[PDB]
Amino acid sequence: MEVIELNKCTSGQSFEVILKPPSDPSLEEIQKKLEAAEERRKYQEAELLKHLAE
Amino acid sequence: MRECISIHVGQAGVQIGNACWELYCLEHGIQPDGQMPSDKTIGGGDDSFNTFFSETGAGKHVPRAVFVDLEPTVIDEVRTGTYRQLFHPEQLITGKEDAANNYARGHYTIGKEIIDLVLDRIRKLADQCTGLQGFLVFHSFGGGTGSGFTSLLMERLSVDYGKKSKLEFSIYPAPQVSTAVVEPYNSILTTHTTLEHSDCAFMVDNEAIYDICRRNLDIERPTYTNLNRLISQIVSSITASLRFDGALNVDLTEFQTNLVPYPRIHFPLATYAPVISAEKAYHEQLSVAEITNACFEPANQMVKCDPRHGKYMACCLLYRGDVVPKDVNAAIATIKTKRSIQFVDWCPTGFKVGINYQPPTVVPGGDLAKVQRAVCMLSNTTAIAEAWARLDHKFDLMYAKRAFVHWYVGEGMEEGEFSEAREDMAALEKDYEEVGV
Amino acid sequence: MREIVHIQAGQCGNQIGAKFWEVISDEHGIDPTGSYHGDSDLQLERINVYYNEATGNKYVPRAILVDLEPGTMDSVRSGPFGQIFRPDNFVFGQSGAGNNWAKGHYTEGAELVDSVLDVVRKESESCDCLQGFQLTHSLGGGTGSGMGTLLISKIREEYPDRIMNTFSVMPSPKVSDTVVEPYNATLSVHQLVENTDETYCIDNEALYDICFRTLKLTTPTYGDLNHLVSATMSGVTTCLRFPGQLNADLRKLAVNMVPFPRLHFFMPGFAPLTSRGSQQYRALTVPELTQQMFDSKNMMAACDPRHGRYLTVAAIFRGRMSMKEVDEQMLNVQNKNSSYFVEWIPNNVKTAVCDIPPRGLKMSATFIGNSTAIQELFKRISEQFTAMFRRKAFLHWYTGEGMDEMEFTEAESNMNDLVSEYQQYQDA
Amino acid sequence: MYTFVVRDENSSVYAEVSRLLLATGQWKRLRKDNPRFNLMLGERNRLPFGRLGHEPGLVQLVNYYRGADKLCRKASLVKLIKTSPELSESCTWFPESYVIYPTDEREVFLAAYNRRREGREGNVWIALISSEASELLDFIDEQGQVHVIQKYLEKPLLLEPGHRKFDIRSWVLVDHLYNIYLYREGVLRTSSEPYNSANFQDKTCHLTNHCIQKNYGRYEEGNEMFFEEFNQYLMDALNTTLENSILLQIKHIIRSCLMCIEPAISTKHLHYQSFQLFGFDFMVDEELKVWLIEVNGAPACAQKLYAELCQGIVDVAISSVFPLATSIFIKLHH
Ligand SMILES: Nc1nc2c(ncn2[C@@H]2O[C@H](COP(=O)(O)OP(=O)(O)OP(=O)(O)O)[C@@H](O)[C@H]2O)c(=O)[nH]1
Ligand SMILES: Nc1ncnc2c1ncn2[C@@H]1O[C@H](COP(=O)(O)OP(=O)(O)CP(=O)(O)O)[C@@H](O)[C@H]1O
Ligand SMILES: Nc1nc2c(ncn2[C@@H]2O[C@H](COP(=O)(O)OP(=O)(O)O)[C@@H](O)[C@H]2O)c(=O)[nH]1
Ligand SMILES: COc1ccc(/C=C/C(=O)c2ccc(OC)c3c2OC(C)(C)C=C3)cc1O
Ligand SMILES: [Ca+2]
Ligand SMILES: [Mg+2]
Ligand SMILES: [Mg+2]
């Protein structure tokens, strides 16, 4: 019902119609997490190479 | 003028990126070689299109875009394709081996090796910016790179660019055009890691787009090219207010202000009309009322769900073509009486409307017919949680048996991250619940 | 990653391996000299996966030919496409394995293995991004079974982050050389469970049954059996060899097909089943292809799929056809027989279509099933093993090479565990 | 072959429906959590509507309308009738009703209760039954649930012989096309003890449920008078038919309720489809005026009628979507 904020230019126009009123981790934390995953990877491959050496 | 940088991650992001930048060029009259004759200020300036394009002394208009993929297949097609001159080689980053549909491999294993190169090539574009406002991030939920690497990049961008806004264009997985059986796993994993780092995210369900192409474009079995041309139209509609003169959604901060009152609930639904076949011999052109009415039909949404059984927090209508405010208001008053449109109590029942007089541009020889008028509605409705419910249930089915988990653990991810990611999703489904019913 | 290093060990390994290279060379338009005499560029786009480009438009199979006996490798070198192989990739011993896994794995093969690994390394170094290894071998003899598994173990030590794929021919009393085959197979299966990512179970029982019961051939030869192996092998490698919708590779196959690491033994299938020479003139429709490729009569492992459940399925259709009709027929099988697909892996069937059909067929379909019914194959071998082992019969052939009974008990134990592991998910 | 899932074990209507479907030999029943179904016979509460219609190569149908609970809970039914312009406050066929909360419209209720006292006319209300307002408000706060207070029908139609009260149950099937089908057989759920004008604690003569009664079975079997007998009684006693005196009003009420909610619940353009069987409960006053009492979203049938109705549900609601190789319904045209 109520039209507000009407702005017009050569390209077009914009407006608001209201019908009814109302009632992060650090760099250190990322680099530590990514390196912790590599330590889990290193350990699993080392366990495989130990198994194969057996 | 304040610049935006577009980031395209993995296969889906890159291919959609191509579709969008093809369209942006056709919209601004920028040639495949980068020349733009209508631009009278050679080699710089602060026009509205400079938000997405920088300029060289020779007059080349170059995208503020970085393409990143862990294998070279897809980006090589950018490197050699019809828009090759547009990007400089530094904007196109590839590895040798992909993430094999594995979030943990994209995030932790291959992610660690390529992240610093990507952030450096991002910093290259950010240095050419007088007033960088933030980032537009294109990726799939389902891919290993699209999910895994994106979430890592998004974390780092918060650290390196704290003041900047981050927006997502995300492809939600559909069995109709799927790559991996573990797509639900990757989706929940990426959403959980990305949630604190995304300000506003536009989800596109591949199922919805597929069926739109089948029903409205008469395409028997839609290709990625078919889907991407359609997506690019929707993306272009969303970003038009950044690239043209106007007073609505003119900066990225305004997307959060206008669409996201609740920061966690940052997934607005996009609905688009009309989608018309170029092969249709006879076409009766559709009015402002007819196209605006179409914005409330499930068949036209980017995500199939039922807004009648949810609540609204915000609503934008973005028109392109022959549209005047008088006709918009006449259309709205009629629709409000005929349709179930329930806003939340702590929000006004209202619509923010933007009109651009230029009708949508279609790619020559595409599937979309030229139209006199078009509209993209952006509504933040709790009904979109239907998609989270669907996705979480598929996750639950697999994870009950710990199926495929070893592939993730094998890349050095702890199994606890699965249940952490899932609990966050359960918390999100509850957030929507409180607001919605 | 795209390059695959192919290894073929022992008699069966080399005989099926040679047939694989004959078939895929014809598909890619390569002649015995190695010169491309094709026409479609699609033949060349992913040719570097199996072929190394040589001096002057010549294509050299990335193939290593291994035996403890000079016999079979002379027959390859003198065979149809024999000239195509790189001469230095012929790695052979002299004394043979005598159908003895212990000779292959511990004594004779241990003497020759380092030489093979030097050739593997030379081929690995030529690779821009090596994705992994495929091995052809039987499990019933000594060289393919014993030395093949030794090789796999050593390759995994040297390349622990690469994929190991095998085509593993399972022994049957229906087509048998020696009584000791169940021993060799059981010792081998033990190695495959631990050291491969993907194994195509090629059952000689099934191949005999298809030849006899279905293909009308009253006395099947090895040649008749190997006609089925090459049609299957061509089909399972299609998406690696041709441009596709998915950009298929060995690692993605593993991630997507294998929900639990030990359960990586695939039941392959082919439609239509044909015998040599006699070409059938009527082409199969898509409903016919889909029906046959799921039927037990078309499985390359002698297991009834109705006795278990599909964990995952991959299917590759070849020829000019309605891709929509392919979707509809494949969805029809799943929606009408949903009890035979685990409900706890959603959307567990993936399908591709390739434009290029195999030689002599307008329409074909290759099945790759990870079914729990594969336990039937391992139980069959395990029963044959036990009937001998409970009397320690024929054991002296192995104890004479320094093997102990303890190693036999462990191999048997691990294969029985595998069986119960399959059963666990057949009821869940 | 078609497929279905059964997700409500306690439902007798859909026990018989699933049994009839199996008997065709063209319907196979699947496990509770099997997503690859054509038909869902769903759970009463928390039905996962959002998971429906997302299965490639399957047309999916469910035996419940999402949003229909607004008609089928007392609290929401009043709010719907009070707020919908198609129904409204001056709605002649629904008794005066007020939403009451315990820790809302209590001040709206008591102000209208005064008009009933200052006019000195009949002032009996139902939540249990009392003639004084604050008598059962002390029982509302005691319960701790949102129950509505409604004007009690003090002058009801009474069957002879017996001077008894009753209610009419109507079975209504709404298909996927939003056709409204009234089952031609309804049931009168009779009282067996005579209606007492000034003794409201005597619940057996005032509340006419099948459970409360079970003089039970004296006048008719299981306190159930069907349509043939009631029509004959109306012809004998009052010189009128069931059709003219009562059924016209019933058909009007059913059409009015379901028309009102039609835009909110319709599955006409949805990715999945709905049908639903409803039980409407009617009261008749002494001047043959029909009043709506409530709507049942999960109704149970009468024993005699189970077979005929359940076949009808299979006929027009199930086989209309999924075809195979007289009508018991009256189509309420709109
Ligand atoms: N709409 C659309 N979806 C795509 C496209 N390419 C891939 N997808 C979807 O993205 C998901 C698979 O992820 P991809 O983006 O292909 O994988 P990726 O990010 O390259 O990661 P990798 O697994 O390392 O290759 C699936 O849901 C596909 O349906 C595209 O061009 N358009
Ligand atoms: N306003 C009113 N005036 C007269 N009688 C009323 C009334 N409200 C309720 N009743 C009587 O009380 C009985 C039960 O009322 P109601 O229909 O609310 O309970 P209920 O939900 O258990 C029946 P159902 O089993 O069909 O769901 C009815 O059979 C009716 O006779
Ligand atoms: N399908 C098939 N099976 C074979 C072939 N040659 C041998 N076999 C089987 O392999 C087993 C014998 O192993 P073989 O490969 O001859 O021994 P190796 O030379 O020591 O590897 C038996 O089960 C045979 O049936 C062949 O060409 N085709
Ligand atoms: C259950 O869902 C899936 C199952 C398997 C895949 C496989 C993806 C591949 O990359 C791949 C790799 C090798 C292949 O040949 C053996 C194939 C292969 O997949 C296709 C192209 C579909 C067919 C064969 C993906 C899934 O989602
Ligand atoms: Ca300029
Ligand atoms: Mg990729
Ligand atoms: Mg032999």
- Taking the alpha carbons of B200, B216, D3, C295 in that order, is the dihedral positive or negative? negative
**Are the C-beta atoms of residues A24 and B197 closer than 8 Å to each other?**
yes
Please give the tally of structural domains in chain C. Answer: 3
Token pair listed for B216: 């409205």
Whole-angstrom distance, CA of residue B17 vs CA of residue B174: 20
Query: C187-208 in b/e burial notation, b at 16+ Cβ within 10 A?
Result: bbbbbbbbbbbbbbbbbbbbbb
Same-domain check for residues C244 and C274: no
Phi and psi, residue D77, nearest 5° = -55, -45
- Residue D28 Ramachandran class (φ > 0 left, ψ -120 to 50 alpha, else beta): beta
Are A25 and B155 in contact by the 8 Å Cβ rule? The answer is yes
Q: Are D57 and C331 within 8 A, CB to CB?
A: yes
Count A/B contacts: CB-CB distance under 8 Å: 109
* Amino acid, res. B27: E
Helix (H) or strand (E) holding B373: strand B373-381
CA B65, B70, B76, B77 dihedral sign is negative
Proximal ligand: closest to the CA of B173: 1
Give, in order, the Cα–Cα distances in Å from C170 to each of C117, C380, C394, D259, D263. Answer: 25, 11, 20, 68, 64
With b meaning 16 or more CB within 10 Å and e meaning fewer, what string describes B318-338? bbbbebebebbbebbeeeeee
Q: Rounded to whole angstroms, how far apart are CA atoms C300 and C204?
A: 8
Closest CA to B151 of B7, B302, B301: B7
In angstroms, the separation between the Cα of residue A48 and the nearest Cα of chain C is: 8
Q: What residue ranges define each of the domains in chain B, with the CATH number in brackets?
A: 1-268 (3.40.50.1440), 269-383 (3.30.1330.20), 384-437 (1.10.287.600)
Give the span between the Cα atoms of B103 and B404, in whole angstroms.
12
Kindly report whether the peptide bond that precedes residue B89 is cis, defined as omega within 30 degrees of 0: no
DSSP-assigned beta bridge partners for residue D291? D283
Three-state secondary structure of C364-421: EEEEEEEEHHHHHHHHHHHHHHHHHHCCCCCCHHHHCCCCCHHHHHHHHHHHHHHHHH
Residue C100 DSSP class: -
Closest by CA to B378, choosing from B314, B327, B322, is B314
- Torsions phi, psi for D285 (to 5 deg): -80, 175
Residue B224 assigned as binding residue: yes
- Nearest atom (ligand 4) to Cα of C244: 21
Coil, strand or helix at B404: coil
Separation CA B84–CA D126 (nearest Å)? 78
Q: Rounded to an integer, what distance in angstroms lies between the CA atom of residue C161 and that of residue D112? A: 81
Residue whose entry in the numeric block shows the structure tokens 């078939």? C23
**CA atoms of C347 and C368, how far apart (whole Å):** 15
Question: C133 to chain A nearest CA, in Å?
Answer: 18
Are residues D82 and D109 both part of a single domain?
no
Residue of A3, A5, A11 for testing the chain B interface, max B β-carbons within 10 Å: A11
D243/D251 Cα distance (integer angstroms): 10
Q: Which chain D residue has the Cα nearest residue B388?
A: D50
What is the whole-number distance in angstroms between the Cα of residue C207 and the centre of ligand 3?
13
3-state DSSP percent of chain A in helix, strand and coil, to 5: 50, 30, 20
Name the residue of C7, C8, C12, C232 to mutate for ligand 3: max ligand atoms within 8 A of Cβ. C12
CA pair distance B387, B393, nearest whole angstrom: 10
Q: How far apart are CA B242 and CA B356, in angstroms?
A: 12
To what resolution in angstroms was this structure determined? 2.1
Distance from C-alpha of D19 to C-alpha of D2, rounded to nearest angstrom: 14
**DSSP helix/strand/coil, B431:** helix
**DSSP code of B235?**
H
Subunit contact C157:A49, Cβ cutoff 8 A: yes
Rounded alpha-carbon distances, angstroms, from residue C22 to A38, C79, C230? 43, 10, 9
The answer to whether residues C21 and C229 touch, using CB atoms and an 8 Å cutoff, is no
Nearest CA to ligand 1 atom 13: B143
Q: Are residues D68 and D185 in the same domain?
A: yes
C157 to A45: CB separation less than 8 angstroms, yes or no: no
- CATH number, domain with residue C153: 3.40.50.1440
Supply the CATH number for residue C387's domain.
Answer: 1.10.287.600
DSSP run (H or E) holding B242: helix B224-243
Domain that holds residue C417: 374-428
Phi, psi of D221 (to 5 degrees): -65, 125
Residues C6 and C149 in one domain: yes
- Residues D39, D150: one domain? no
Q: Which residue of C has its CA nearest to B100?
A: C252
C358 secondary structure, DSSP code: P
Residues D134 and D163 in one domain: no
All residues at 6 or more sequence positions from C307 whose CB lies less than 8 Å from its CB, including other chains = C373, C376
Q: Please check whether residues D180 and D126 belong to one and the same domain.
A: no
Annotated binding residue at B301? no
Collapsed DSSP state (helix, strand, coil) of residue B222: coil
Residues D76 and D225 in one domain: yes
Q: Which two tokens stand for residue D170?
A: 């109507």
Q: What are the Cα distances from residue C193, in Å, to B421, C413, C415?
A: 32, 12, 8
Beta B312-321 vs B373-381: how paired, if at all? antiparallel
Distance from C-alpha of D313 to C-alpha of A36, rounded to nearest angstrom: 61
Is D283 close to ligand 2, i.e. is its CB under 6 Å away? yes
Ligand 4 in contact with C252 (CB < 6 A)?
Answer: yes
∠ Cα D309 D312 D318 (to 5°): 130
Residues C221 and C295 in one domain: no
> Which residues of chain D lie closer than 8 angstroms to B305, CB-CB?
50
Q: Which residues partner with A8 through β-bridges?
A: A13
- What is d(CA C116, CA B370) in angstroms, rounded to the nearest whole number? 64
Q: Ligand 4 pocket check: which of C311, C334, C342, C350 to mutate, most ligand atoms within 8 Å of Cβ? A: C350
The last residue of a domain, from among C259, C293, C313: C259
The pair of three-digit structure tokens given for residue D329, joined into one six-digit string: 């319904």
Show Cβ contacts of residue B107 under 8 Å, excluding neighbours closer than 6 positions. B147, B148, B149, B151, B152, B189, B193, B413
What is the DSSP track for C276-341?
SS----SPPPHHHHHHHHHSGGGBSSS--GGGS-EEEEEEEEESS--HHHHHHHHHHHHHHSGGGB
Neighbouring C-beta atoms of residue B22, cutoff 10 Å: 20
C66 with C79, same domain: the answer is yes
User: Same domain for D217 and D280?
Assistant: yes
How long a stretch of residues is chain D?
334
Question: CA geometry: angle at B29 spanning B24 and B31, to 5°?
Answer: 90
DSSP, collapsed to helix, strand or coil, labels residue B163 as: coil
Amino acid identity of residue C421, one-letter, is E
D204: CB partners within 8 A, 6+ apart: D191, D192, D193, D212, D213
Q: D56 and chain B: CB distance < 8 Å anywhere? A: yes
Answer whether A49 touches C (CB < 8 Å).
yes
Residue nearest to atom 16 of ligand 1 (CA): B11
**In chain A, which residue's Cα lies nearest the Cα of B354?**
A14
Short-list C137, C139, C162, CA closest to C66: C137
Partner-chain residue, chosen from C328, C343, C346, that has the shortest CB–CB distance to D31: C343
Task: Provide the Cα torsion B31, B37, B43, B49; round to 10°.
Answer: -70
Residue of A46, D67, D32 whose CA lies nearest to B308? D67
C-alpha to C-alpha distance for B268 and B249, rounded to whole angstroms: 14
**Chain C residues within an 8 Å CB radius of B397:** 343-346
Which chains are adjacent to chain B, needing at least 3 Cβ pairs under 8 Å? A, C, D
Residue C94 CA to chain centroid, in angstroms?
A: 26
Is residue D227 located within the same domain as residue D294? yes
- Among D172, D175, D191, residue whose Cα is nearest residue D250: D172
Residue pairs spanning A and C at CB distance below 8 A: 9
Residues D148 and D207 in one domain: no
Largest CA distance in chain D: 68
In the block, tokens 């001998």 appear at C388
Q: Pick the atom of ligand 3 nearest to C15's CA.
A: 27
List pocket residues of ligand 3, CB cut-off 6 Å. Answer: C 10-13, 15-16, 97, 138, 140-144, 169, 171, 175, 177, 181, 204, 207, 222, 225-226, 229
* C142 annotated binding-site participant: yes
Helices marked H in C196-307 — which ranges?
Answer: 204-209, 222-241, 250-257, 286-294
Of C147, C161, C170, give the one whose Cα is nearest residue C64: C147
Show Cβ contacts of residue D101 under 8 Å, excluding neighbours closer than 6 positions: D146
> End-to-end distance of chain C based on CA atoms, in angstroms?
36
Say yes or no: C141 and C268 in one domain: no
Catalytic site includes residue B254: yes
User: What 8-state DSSP symbol labels residue B415?
Assistant: T
Secondary element (H or E) of residue B9 = strand B4-9
Token pair 């190569």 in the structure block, residue:
D57
Which burial class, exposed, middle or buried, applies to B260 when counting CB atoms under 10 A from its CB (0-12, 13-18, 19+)?
Answer: buried
DSSP B261-297: SSSS---PEEEEE---BTT-SS-PPPPHHHHHHHTT-
Task: Tell me: do C176 and C66 sit in the same domain.
Answer: yes
How far apart are alpha carbons B356 and B323 in whole angstroms? Answer: 8
The CATH number of residue D136's host domain is 3.30.1490.20
Is residue C57 classed as helix, strand or coil in its secondary structure?
Answer: coil
Distance CA C136, CA C63 (A): 11
Q: How far apart are CA B192 and CA D157, in angstroms?
A: 63
Ligand closest to C368 (CA) is: 4
- Looking at D41, D63, D85, which one is the last position of a domain? D63
The set of residues, in sequence order, having a beta carbon less than 8 Å from that of D17 and lying 6+ positions away, is D41, D63, D310, D313, D314, D318
D131 and D50 in a single domain? The answer is: no
Task: Measure in Å the smallest separation between the Cα of C264 and chain B Cα atoms.
Answer: 12
Contacts 24+ apart (CB under 8 A), B222-225: B222/B177, B224/B15, B224/B177
Label each residue of chain D as H, E or C: CEEEEECCCCCHHHHHHHHHHHHHCCEEEECCCCCCCCEEECCCCCCCHHHCCCCCCCCCEECCCCCCHHHHCHHHHHHHHHHCCCCCCCCCCCCCEEEECCCCCCHHHHHHHHHHHHCCCCCCEECCEECCHHHHHHHHHHHCCCEEEEECCCCECCECCCCECEEEEEEEEECCCCCEEEECCCEEEECCCCCCCCCCCCHHHHCCCHHHHCCCCCCCHHHEECHHHHHHHHHHHCCCCHHHHHHHHHHHHHHHHHHHHHHHHCCCCCCCEECEEEEEEEEEECCCCEEEEEEECCCCCCCCCHHHHHHHHHHHHHCCCCCCCCCCEEECCC
> Which residues contact residue B110 at a Cβ distance below 8 angstroms, ignoring those fewer than 6 apart?
B70, B95, B97, B98, B99, B145, B148, B149
∠ CA C227-C231-C232 to the nearest 5 degrees? Answer: 115
The number of folded domains in chain D is 3
Helical segments of C34-107, H only = 71-77, 101-105
Q: How near does any CA of chain C get to the CA of D3, in Å?
A: 8
- Interface contact flag, C256 B394, Cβ < 8 Å: no
- Nearest partner of B12 among B168, B212, B119, B213, judged by Cα: B168
Name the helix (H) or strand (E) containing B148: none
Catalytic site residue from B113, B207, B220, B254: B254
Q: Angle C187-C193-C197 (CA atoms, 0-180°, nearest 5)?
A: 135
H or E segment to which residue C350 belongs: strand C349-354
Residue nearest to atom 10 of ligand 4 (CA): C248
Angstrom distance (rounded) from CA B87 to CA B64? 9
CATH number at residue D325: 3.30.470.20
Where does B220-367 show beta strands of DSSP type E?
269-273, 312-321, 349-356
Query: Which of B262, B331, B339 minimizes the C-alpha distance to B297?
Result: B339
Q: Could you tell me which residues come within 8 angstroms of residue D74 by beta carbon, excluding any fewer than 6 positions away?
A: D147, D148, D294
Q: What are phi and psi of D310, to 5 degrees?
A: -60, -35
User: Of C146, C244, C254, whose CA–CA distance to C200 is shortest?
Assistant: C254
Shared domain check, C418 and C315: no
Tell me the C-alpha distance between B193 and C241, whole Å. 37
Nearest to C52 by CA among C114, C122, C108: C122
Do C327 and D30 make contact, defined as CB atoms within 8 angstroms? no
Complete edge-to-edge strand list for the sheet that includes strand C90-92:
C90-92, C63-67, C3-9, C130-138, C163-170, C198-203, C265-271, C364-371, C310-318, C349-354
Distances (CA, A) of B149 to B66, B95, C251, D241: 14, 12, 18, 76
Q: Which two tokens stand for residue C129?
A: 């991004």
Method: X-ray
Q: Verify that D219 and D281 share a domain, yes or no.
A: yes
Containing structural domain, residue D107: 96-154
State whether C156 and A52 contact (CB < 8 Å).
Answer: yes
Nearest to C272 by CA among C360, C374, C198, C331: C360
Q: In the listed set C349, C373, C397, which residue is the last one of a domain according to the structure?
A: C373
Sheet (strand B373-381) strand order: A2-8, A12-20, B349-356, B312-321, B373-381, B269-273
3-state secondary structure of C354: strand
Shortest Cα–Cα distance, B433 to chain C (Å): 26
Q: Which residues pair with C51 in a beta bridge?
A: C61
**Same domain, yes or no: C49 and C195:** yes
Give B222 to chain A, closest Cα distance, Å: 34
Q: Do residues C220 and C333 share a domain? A: no
Is D220's C-beta closer than 6 angstroms to any atom of ligand 2?
A: no
Residue B354 marked ligand-binding: no
Same domain, C192 and C58: yes
Calculate how far, in angstroms, residue C253's C-alpha sits from the geometric centre of ligand 1. Answer: 16
Contact assessment for residue B271 and residue B377, using Cβ atoms and an 8 Å cutoff: yes
Residue of chain D whose Cα is closest to the Cα of C327: D57
**D-interface mutation test, from B211, B308, B384, most D Cβ less than 10 A away:** B308
Q: DSSP assignment, residue B16?
A: H
CB-based contact C327 D1, cutoff 8 Å: no
Rounded to whole angstroms, the Cα distance separating B97 from B76 reads 14
Does the beta carbon of D292 sit less than 6 angstroms from any atom of ligand 2?
A: no
Sign of the alpha-carbon torsion through B400, B405, B409, B413? negative
Contact A/D (≥3 CB pairs under 8 Å): no
Statement to judge: residues C243 and C300 lie in one domain: no
From residue D239, how far is each of D231, D234, D248 by CA, in Å? 10, 6, 17
* B107 strand-pairing partners: none
Q: Find all residues with CB under 8 Å of B399, minimum gap 6, and list them.
A: B185, B405, B418, B422
SS3 C45: coil
The DSSP symbol for B157 reads: H
Cβ neighbours of residue B114 closer than 8 Å, sequence gap 6 or more: B68, B70, B93, B95, B149
Please note each residue after which chain C is broken, C-to-N distance over 2.5 A, or write none: none
User: Is the torsion defined by CA of B213, B219, B222, B223 positive or negative?
Assistant: negative
Please tell me the distance from the alpha carbon of residue D195 to that of residue D208, in angstroms, as a whole number. Answer: 11
Same domain, C351 and C226: no
Same domain assignment for residues D184 and D249: yes
Query: What is the position in ligand 2's atom list of the atom closest to the CA of D211?
Result: 25
Q: For residue D102, which of D55, D43, D149 has the smallest C-alpha distance? A: D149
* 3-state DSSP percent of chain B in helix, strand and coil, to 5: 45, 20, 35
The C-alpha angle with vertex C358 and arms to C332 and C294, in degrees rounded to 5, equals 25
Burial of residue D30 (number of CB atoms within 10 Å: 0-12, 13-18, 19+): middle
- The total number of residues shown for chain A amounts to 54
- CB atoms < 10 A from the CB of B238, how many? 23
**DSSP labels for C109-127?**
HHHHHHHHHHHHHHHHHT-
